[PDB]
């Protein structure tokens, strides 16, 4: 919560470095190591652990249990894919606070779903929030951050989906950030800074990394270096779902096969015409399943 001087043992000056190395909440101050928080200019070791044992206090981040357990929980919003097979085997849609993968082969539809859930993000008929743990003015004036990583990103698709779920396409395209990545370094670079536009006023409630894992696999390509890839594909991952858990914003991404995390996962297959499956063969809490759906002039539907 943005006003840091509310920290016992932290004053006006103290705080001024902290906004400037990066920290407003107080929550990223509670979840640092004495490490990260002392590179900054004058903070040492016992002022850094204090207020960071301080920020735990403030966030109450301690041991839950009974009807506090399922509290913790109705935090998480989802967003719909627009499919309705699809979000009932997400039991609502994809998830806050994780990691939702849709891997397949070519043409099988990853891109399309990325597409079209910048679109629903922007109807609040397509968020299903709990009240009871996801205050309203939390969700409003949500943005996008679609890091397009082979550059099929088509502003024109997603003015198609939206004039096809009859919004404004414009009004799409305002509230969507689009970078251009051309390797593993600017993909994963654009993935930090994502904190900036948070400090700038956005409210980045949807990240998508399409692809995950193409840029990796071709400046990696031999399979000796196959460990370097692993760790900075591996760093790369955490960071995503650091800033899921942190900004309660859903993360998404793709991956094109013919091992990394994430929570959620899906294999993608196109079937007899428009339609496509997606299978859900990864989840904590949810059964293998398939949903059939189609993809159309108005994008996602059935
Ligand atoms: N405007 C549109 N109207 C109807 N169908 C469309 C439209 N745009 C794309 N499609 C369909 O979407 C399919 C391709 O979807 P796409 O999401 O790009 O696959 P992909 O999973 O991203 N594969 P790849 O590009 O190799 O990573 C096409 O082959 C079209 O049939
Ligand atoms: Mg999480
Ligand atoms: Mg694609």
Redesign the pocket.
Known sequence: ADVLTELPGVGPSTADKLIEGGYLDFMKIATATIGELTDIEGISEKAAAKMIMAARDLCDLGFKSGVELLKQRQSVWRLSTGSTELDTVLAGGIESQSVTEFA?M????????MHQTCVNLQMREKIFADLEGVVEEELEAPKAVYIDT?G?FRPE?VV?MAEGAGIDGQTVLDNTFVARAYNSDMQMLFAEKIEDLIKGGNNIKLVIID?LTSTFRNEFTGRGKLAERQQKLGRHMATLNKLADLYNCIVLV?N?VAGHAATFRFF?RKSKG?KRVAKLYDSPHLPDSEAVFR???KGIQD
Not at 106 to 113: A, E, N, P, V
Request: charged share 25%.
């Open positions: 397949g070519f043409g099988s539809g990853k891109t399309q779903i082979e099929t698709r198609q692809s793709t094109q993608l428009d993809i159309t002039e």
